[PDB]
């Protein structure tokens, strides 16, 4: 009985940004990301490519893997939820640098070119499109709490925490709100990087999960919960 919309042409949903706080959205914060640049040309320090320089720097090379952050971004951006324009990704570098990842970005799939992109971003503070029509990656002011939606539920991925069904958790949760997931891209460490911001801690599976699989597993649950398909 309801009259049809005047225009039925499928239109891309709006690109979510930090400025808009009202829309229900999924935030995924890739905390403890190990991204740091150093002159040899500046190269994103890698656990395998460079061990001596990190030893000379004195930081343990175990926590010197930008690959994990690369893999998490690949699965997060390629998930259908991002295609529906309901997911914006943040990265908190271990040093303390916060990076806003525009959902429109198409990061290079190979790791070598990804490193070339990061060194550009960390020094130039922004990455512009090839056709130059918006900033894809931009550094922003800490703390992350300001940039998150005004009404938002905060959680972080903990193995010790109780196991939950992600689809059920999102369903019981309110609607005007938004869900923020703190994922630890660190290879190994104490799950307290986001204790100051987060209000409670949850577990997704009984077995240990990688950063990449854990975020993708959480995204698919939101996709079913909101019927993103």
């Amino acid at each position: 009985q309801k009259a049809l919309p005047a225009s039925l042409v499928p239109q891309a949903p709006p690109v979510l940004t930090s400025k808009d706080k009202i829309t229900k959205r999924m935030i995924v914060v890739l905390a403890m990301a190990s991204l740091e640049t150093h002159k040899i040309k500046y190269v994103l320090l890698n656990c395998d490519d460079h061990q001596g320089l990190l030893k000379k720097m004195g930081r343990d090379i175990s926590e010197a893997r930008p690959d994990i952050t690369h893999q998490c971004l690949l699965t997060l951006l390629d998930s259908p939820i991002n295609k529906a324009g309901k997911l914006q990704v943040y990265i908190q570098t271990s040093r303390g640098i916060l990076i806003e990842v525009n959902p429109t970005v198409r990061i290079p799939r190979t790791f070598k070119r990804f490193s070339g992109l990061m060194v550009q971003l960390l020094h130039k503070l922004s990455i512009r499109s090839v056709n130059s029509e918006e900033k894809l990656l931009k550094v922003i002011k800490n703390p992350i709490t300001d940039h998150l939606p005004t009404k938002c539920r905060k959680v972080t991925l903990s193995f010790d925490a109780p196991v939950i069904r992600v689809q059920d958790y999102i369903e019981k949760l309110d609607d005007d709100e938004s869900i923020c997931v703190f994922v630890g891209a660190m290879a190994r460490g104490k799950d307290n990087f986001a204790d100051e911001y987060v209000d409670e801690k949850v577990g997704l599976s009984n077995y240990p999960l990688s950063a990449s699989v854990a975020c993708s597993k959480f995204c698919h649950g939101a996709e079913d919960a909101w019927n993103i398909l």
């Binding site: 049809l4 225009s7 039925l8 042409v9 499928p10 019927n227 398909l229």
Partner: protein, 129 residues
């Protein structure tokens, strides 16, 4: 008329919704009246354009492509009628001969013994020399 959203099936729809959708399909009847002389009382708005659906299977390729537009989003603001109004059978044949793209002729692998039927394999049953 091109599409009724109520009859679309969604994967997330619950089994009860599936059952309700099935009953709606079984009960449907076309309400368009062809003999009514008042255009406002023909109930065409409640009917649908099945006739345009058939035309995408038209033998001519280009005519089929035009009919496919109703299956595509309505991006174009309008179509210039003067570019389509006065076409004739002669125009189609002449336009067909003066085709921008020239293709290779193909051949049929199947073989027919006799072109016309008698009074093995016959290409035109029911026609005889």
């Amino acid at each position: 008329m091109l599409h009724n959203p109520a009859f679309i099936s969604n994967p997330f729809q619950t089994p009860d919704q599936v059952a309700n959708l099935k009953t709606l399909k079984e009960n449907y009847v076309d309400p368009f009246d062809v003999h009514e002389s008042d255009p406002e009382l023909t109930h065409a708005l409640d009917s649908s354009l099945w006739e345009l659906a058939s035309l995408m299977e038209h033998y001519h390729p280009n005519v089929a492509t035009l009919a496919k537009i109703f299956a595509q989003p309505f991006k174009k603001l309008s179509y210039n009628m003067e570019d389509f109004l006065d076409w004739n059978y002669d125009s189609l044949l002449n336009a067909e001969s003066s085709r921008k793209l020239k293709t290779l002729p193909t051949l049929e692998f199947e073989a027919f013994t006799n072109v016309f039927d008698n009074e093995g394999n016959v290409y035109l049953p029911g026609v005889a020399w």
